[PDB]
Amino acid sequence: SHMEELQNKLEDVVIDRNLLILGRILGEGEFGSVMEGNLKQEDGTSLKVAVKTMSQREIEEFLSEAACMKDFSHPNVIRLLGVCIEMSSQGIPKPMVILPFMKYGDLHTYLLYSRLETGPRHIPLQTLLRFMVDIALGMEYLSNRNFLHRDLAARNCMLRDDMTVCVADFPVKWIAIESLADRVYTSKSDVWAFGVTMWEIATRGMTPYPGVQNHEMYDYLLHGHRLKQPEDCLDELYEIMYSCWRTDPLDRPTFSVLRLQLERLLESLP
């Protein structure tokens, strides 16, 4: 059964490389690049997509990992469309991930662009808190499938045509105190990272803990200091984000609890 489900998921996940046309490069780096593409669909029409380029063992885990994420269906979690693996001239495998195109790019850049004239308009507080709700909803879905994100941050949240946020790509300043110390990581560690992401949103893209350096962070945290309240951040919003950084991770709210707080606060806005 367990196996049977894995076998099916595996069936679905691969896309014939001839259904796919690559385009220009949207952002090149270390692990690799993100490029625009067209995915030929079952109905005969093409779809604009994004295309991410990243041992047979690491190949097979990539494929098994891709199969599980393809099963994820929620509007605040980025849909994996499928995978291609095209071989090089030197012979190393090149594993491509296919994603729906996110017109507005990543949330962190978008927030930064918004403080420029020619960027997106100033983002009203209501919209910012809607971004938080969307992300909490995404992470609730994940925590209910017991899946850990590991790298939640504003730069890994993506903005869709319709300004829905979805979590994606699932960084000392984002890492829970317990995980710095004992390398151990629960959903409550994702909750920590969420709390930081909320702050990145509420500051419109500031790097967490100005004036503190990465190497200083465990002690800074170990002495009870946390991120400060941003100017024009509602106290209730700050309370919600501060609960994410409680020392005991058992004392932190679940995503489901956070989401419910965030939506209530949003509803109470005029």
Ligand X SMILES: CCc1nc(C(N)=O)c(Nc2ccc(N3CCC(N4CCN(C)CC4)CC3)c(OC)c2)nc1NC1CCOCC1
Binding of Cl ion by 228 (CB under 5 A)? yes
Long-range contacts of 169-176 (CB under 8 A, 24+ apart): 170/69, 170/142, 172/214, 172/217, 173/207, 173/208, 173/209, 173/214, 173/217, 174/208, 176/245, 176/249
Q: Site for Cl ion (CB under 5 A): which residue of 15, 21, 68, 163?
A: 21
- CA neighbor of 175 nearest in space, from 158, 140, 150: 150
**Would you call 2 helix, strand, or coil by DSSP?**
helix
The nearest distance, CB 133 to ligand X, in angstroms, is 20
Q: Which listed option, Cl ion, ligand X, none, makes contact with residue 50 (CB within 5 to 8 Å by class)?
A: ligand X
- Neighbouring CB atoms inside 10 A of 165's CB total 28
Binders in 68-97 for Cl ion, by CB under 5 A: 79
Minimum CB distance to Cl ion, residue 96 (Å) = 10
**Contact residues for ligand X (CB under 6 A)?**
26-27, 34, 50, 52, 78, 99-102, 105-106, 155, 158, 168-169
Decide which of Cl ion, ligand X, none touches 14; Cβ closer than 5 to 8 Å per partner kind.
none
**Strand pairing class (46-53; 82-87):** unpaired
What is the 8-class DSSP label of residue 207? P
Among residues 10, 22, 26, 85, the one that binds Cl ion under rule CB under 5 A: 22
Residues 6 or more apart whose Cβ sits within 8 Å of residue 123? 111, 114, 204
- The pair of structure tokens assigned to 19 is 């259904």
**Does 163 engage in binding with Cl ion (CB under 5 A)?**
no
Closest to ligand X by CB, 165 vs 237, is: 165
Phi/psi at 53 (5° precision) = -105, 120
- Write out the catalytic residue numbers: 151
| Shortest distance (Å) from residue 268 CB to Cl ion | 26
# chain residues binding Cl ion, by CB under 5 A = 8
Binding site for Cl ion (CB under 5 A): 21-22, 79, 100, 206, 209, 227-228
Question: Residues within the annotated binding site?
Answer: 26-34, 48
